């Protein structure tokens, strides 16, 4: 239920040839919840713990999406942090998995960033009215979102009619539990530069180049 009891669980699991937690450390979307759990002091507190996990050899330095997914699906790690879309590949593997609330850090909960998958029409396209038709009358329908959800889950779909089917899923309940503890991303044009500044800051601190205090200095600029 807490991040601070993972090192103990990893010491217990490494004795049996297994890891405790493997998740994508390269992309900052997956590390941000732990980083923004307390809050600044909250980012410094959050990132120092993440660095200590790698410094204590609990987590590998270059842990990407592919080696973390493969490790969880193979049954080499006990846990992983991923979104709705990731469940279909676990169902395919012979793993009895469970989706739950993200662990708390310093008592407070880990605040992930809530995304809304959205389809936008390209301004330099001659097929604008044909795409509108497709998006409206075919994709954003009970039959259209079903075809996509059975391939790889969409998450808590925006379609009002799906409310009962989403409320019947134990995993969508855990997704909404984390979404309420998190917050929706502002769409602003500066998000690109922000996401780049956090991506570099996490990689430098994880590999062992820049200090945690100097990472937030370069990222705040």
């Amino acid at each position: 239920k807490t991040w601070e009891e993972i090192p103990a669980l990893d010491k217990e699991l490494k004795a049996k040839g297994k890891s405790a937690l493997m998740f994508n450390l390269q992309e900052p979307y997956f590390t941000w919840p732990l980083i923004a759990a307390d809050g600044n002091a909250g980012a410094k507190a959050g990132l120092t713990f993440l660095v200590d996990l790698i410094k204590n050899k609990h987590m590998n330095a270059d842990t990407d999406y592919s080696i973390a997914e493969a490790a969880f699906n193979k049954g080499e790690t006990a846990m992983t942090i991923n979104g709705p879309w990731a469940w279909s590949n676990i169902d395919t593997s012979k793993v009895n998995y469970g989706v739950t609330v993200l662990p708390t850090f310093k008592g407070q909960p880990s605040k992930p960033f809530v995304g809304v998958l959205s389809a936008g029409i390209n301004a330099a396209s001659p097929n604008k009215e044909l795409a509108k038709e497709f998006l409206e009358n075919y994709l954003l329908t009970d039959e259209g979102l079903e075809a996509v959800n059975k391939d790889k889950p969409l998450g808590a779909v925006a379609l009002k009619s799906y409310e009962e089917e989403l409320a019947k899923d134990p995993r969508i309940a855990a997704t909404m539990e984390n979404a309420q503890k998190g917050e929706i991303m502002p769409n602003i044009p500066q998000m690109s530069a922000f996401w780049y500044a956090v991506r570099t800051a996490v990689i430098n601190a994880a590999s062992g180049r820049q200090t945690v205090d100097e990472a937030l200095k370069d990222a705040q600029t």
């Binding site: 739950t100 609330v101 409320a167 019947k168 134990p170 969508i172």
Partner: protein
């Protein structure tokens, strides 16, 4: 059969904790009745039939607990150490208050027997009706009832703490969350009487009149505490 249509009943197969627990429940209602002496003469026979009203109240109260137990183990189907622990705390309480309930049910049936005018038999048999005994009477059964509902709340929260392992959906999360508040609200009335009797604001029977009067205002006081949490 079932309470909710959205709930998926995990404990539909019968288990050792459930069997063991029924056995204790069956014994409580059975020994409460059959702990009585065997009639050897018509006088003993008519005496034992006056005990049905007190016993009917006792059994009615015990099966209500048995029902809440049945529904809990039907919903979640739990069988862990902490569930085994809390469950024992429950059947342990049940067991210690079996005979004291026989006592209270008899005592209250003679007071109400005197009020309605059905019978006019003495109450000196029961001891000295003094302020300290009548205070200890409330505090005892109040503590007893509070424990039962407190344990039920603790058991629904243990299921809630294991919501992901049981694979509870949003409808099943809300039921479990509502069942805790329901049992805590049920344990707030005996706790409030118990607290009022122990402090003793008046230092006389008035204290026991109030503490007893909270049970007659059970539904309305449970609605006040429930509204306070929703109003904020």
């Amino acid at each position: 059969v079932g309470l909710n249509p959205n709930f998926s009943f995990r404990g539909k197969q019968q288990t050792r904790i459930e069997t063991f627990s029924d056995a204790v429940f069956a014994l409580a209602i059975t020994l409460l009745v059959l702990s009585s002496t065997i009639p050897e003469t018509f006088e003993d026979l008519w005496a034992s039939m006056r005990d049905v009203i007190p016993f009917a109240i006792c059994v009615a109260l015990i099966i209500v607990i048995w029902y809440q137990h049945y529904i809990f183990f039907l919903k979640y189907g739990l069988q862990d150490k902490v569930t085994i622990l809390l469950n024992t705390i429950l059947l342990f309480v049940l067991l210690v208050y079996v005979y004291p309930l026989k006592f209270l049910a008899r005592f209250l049936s003679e007071i109400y027997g005197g009020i309605f005018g059905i019978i006019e038999t003495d109450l000196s048999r029961f001891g000295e009706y003094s302020h300290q005994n009548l205070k200890l009477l409330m505090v005892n059964y109040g503590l007893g009832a509070f424990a039962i509902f407190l344990v039920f709340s603790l058991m629904y929260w243990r299921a809630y703490k294991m919501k992901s392992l049981l694979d509870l959906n949003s409808y099943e999360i809300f039921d479990t969350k509502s069942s805790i508040i329901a049992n805590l609200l049920m344990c707030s009335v005996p706790l409030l009487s118990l607290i009022i009797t122990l402090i003793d604001p008046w230092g006389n029977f008035r204290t026991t009149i109030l503490s007893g009067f909270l049970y007659f205002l059970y539904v309305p006081i449970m609605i006040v505490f429930g509204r306070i949490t929703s109003k904020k």
